[PDB]
Amino acid sequence: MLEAQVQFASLWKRLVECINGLVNEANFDCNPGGLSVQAMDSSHVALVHMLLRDDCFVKYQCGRNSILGLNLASLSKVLKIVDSNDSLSLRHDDDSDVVTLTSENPEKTRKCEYQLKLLEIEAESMGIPEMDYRSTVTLNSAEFAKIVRDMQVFGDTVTIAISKEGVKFSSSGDVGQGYTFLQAAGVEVTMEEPITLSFALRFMGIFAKGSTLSERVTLKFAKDSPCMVEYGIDNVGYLRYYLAPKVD
Amino acid sequence: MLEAQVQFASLWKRLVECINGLVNEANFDCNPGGLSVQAMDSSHVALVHMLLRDDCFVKYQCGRNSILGLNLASLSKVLKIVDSNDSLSLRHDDDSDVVTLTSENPEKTRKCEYQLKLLEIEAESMGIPEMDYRSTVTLNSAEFAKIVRDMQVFGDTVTIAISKEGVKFSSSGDVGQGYTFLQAAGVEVTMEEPITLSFALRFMGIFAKGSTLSERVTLKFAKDSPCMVEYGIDNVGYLRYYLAPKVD
Amino acid sequence: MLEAQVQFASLWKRLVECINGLVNEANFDCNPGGLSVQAMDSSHVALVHMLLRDDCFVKYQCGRNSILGLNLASLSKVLKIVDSNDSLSLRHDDDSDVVTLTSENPEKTRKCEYQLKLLEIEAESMGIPEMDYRSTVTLNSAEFAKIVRDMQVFGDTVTIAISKEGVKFSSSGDVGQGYTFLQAAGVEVTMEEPITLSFALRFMGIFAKGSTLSERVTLKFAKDSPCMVEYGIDNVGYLRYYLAPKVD
Description:
homotrimer, alpha+beta, Proliferating Cell Nuclear Antigen, 9-stranded antiparallel β-sheet, 5-stranded antiparallel β-sheet, 4 helices, 18 strands, 16% helix, elongated, Pr_cel_nuc_antig_CS (chains A, B, C), nucleus (chains A, B, C)
């Protein structure tokens, strides 16, 4: 028996777009502590972790640790048609084969109910990278997203370069070469190594949809490792993406 | 020698857009009691009747009664180039092959004049049902339009249920099942008897575009009777759609 | 070498859009006088001539006459991602095979540096054919844009017709037959005789994007001659297009 009402559907909408950019279906892992979604893309290069804590909701009910597999195509299609400022209640009854979304005004004059069939999705091996990072940069989410889009005019690969002065995103291709250089303040570096890696812009792109959730974004880098980009969802959750670097 | 100056060309623009949704060509019945298009889609399932009473125009003139066949696709292309806040005089002359649109500024500094070829179109041998309709509902025209587009994510068929409590719009398909319920008395339901019919969303869709003319819309129903959907062009005319239900 | 710095990159963004419509590569002739593109379209029917004068730039060094072949496609692609409000400094060091654009933020938190390869651009065939222009006509550049967009629904050839009263742009095609007349209101016609040319609309449309650089535009005509359409950039240069008439 589960029931998670949220005040403003804005949140669910912005979130599902965010994880849908990375995967078609995923398991909604619901505990008394909150909804969790963990998922890897089909090329096993990059990973989403999303937590929404119990207090993120107006009302949250999850005695048992039930799981829900959900088609994020259908889910996304449906959230599309739900007003930003309407309330949205996700509920699964005791052994139904469908989850239900349920939507109302502030003023109760219109009520929408949608039902989605669930799916056996084999929960994956996957594995959050277990490391700690000796380099962290925080910056404006929207600026971040613009920088990936920028770099894409050049390549499929951005080269990030943290130093104590600031980060230096670079890229190359037929069009030419470009970099965008950032300076500390603005940007918040916390480095202890001239550490500089390369990544797939396709994914950085996908991750950067995170700016719909959070004015700021933190990137984290350990030498030769899966970087992390984190989007704080208020103080009541996070969106976390981990991506493998390109290596020789 | 027809002549028909509307004053704000928006009306003609917003109208043709609507009716063009349903049909590529249409005869304009031009009496001294106004203009009226009557027409069926090619799948002979859905009907438009629009009348602009002669009080509608700041200049009307139709001694005789003429029919004028028009390619609406071409009439639409010309009308998308016409500034909503301009004069728009229509005009046909005796044995003339061509009708003539003519726009002017408020401040008489810009004259535009287009010229379209008439068609011969076979006169329509279905026209109106002439029905009772004792079941009625009236709701904000944009919500109606939002709703048909919403229901379209689920299926090609909307099922409309009317009780005195309200009006439920339901739909089913691959994605899931959806419904949108509206409360009564903001919706003015008023029925004699509780009934529920089903319809092709394609056409409901087409009809909904009427939301650009009237802020409110009126639906009327009857058991195994082509429903009607009506849009008052304020008090100077109407646009009216009729659609066959889907029975088993 | 050459340095040229603009205060607001808006200018370059808006210029390269205009001239890229006509040709995908051009030579920038650079003097102490200023930057200067001059280029024909590949059918030798239309000619662009831009001048950015030395005072257009906050900073402009160019000791000797270098000539730079640039790929306007690529430049366009880069400039699309430069912010309007950032500055843009364009340098080239004398044996370098590369031009380099640099973009700083007013508050110095962000610096961007893109670099493009030069091209050996063979054709500088050229030849600004000045003649004595009898008739002039000057009008709001957006209206002119709009008029050609409109004339395009009819045909691919506009006939401009200039007289005491004003000017009549007309066109014909499968859709029908339109015209647009502008009274001498502003609209400063200032002719000597009646005069009626016709012109490819494709090109007129390419030209009409100049409306992003100048609230007004000016057309000059001469019997059996190329027209000129000029857009002035402040008092610091011009963009000037020349188009041959259709005769037959």
